[PDB]
Design a protein around this nucleic acid. Structure first.
Length: 46
DNA sequence: TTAAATAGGGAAGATAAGCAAAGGGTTGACGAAAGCCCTTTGTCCC
């Protein structure tokens, strides 16, 4: 129920991130992940 | 071209009825990340 979608994501050039600069300009491709900000109700983006 | 001295107490402010219907509220322009092909320029090999 969850794994197949994980192979779906890793098949393409997907990335998991919490902070990015693409929200200021669409042409940006900067993605970084922060481990210290992970909590119970922390929303992430991909 | 005046010195002082005060300016009311009481009562009381109406009720009933009703405020409409119909029609319409616009279009056109503001994408990134690739795949393939061709051409040109430049480098290297044969």
């Amino acid at each position: 129920m969850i794994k197949e979608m994980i192979e779906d994501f890793i098949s393409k050039g997907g990335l998991i991130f919490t902070h990015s600069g693409r929200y200021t300009n669409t042409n940006n491709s900067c993605f970084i992940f922060n481990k210290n900000d992970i909590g119970v109700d922390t929303k992430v983006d991909m």
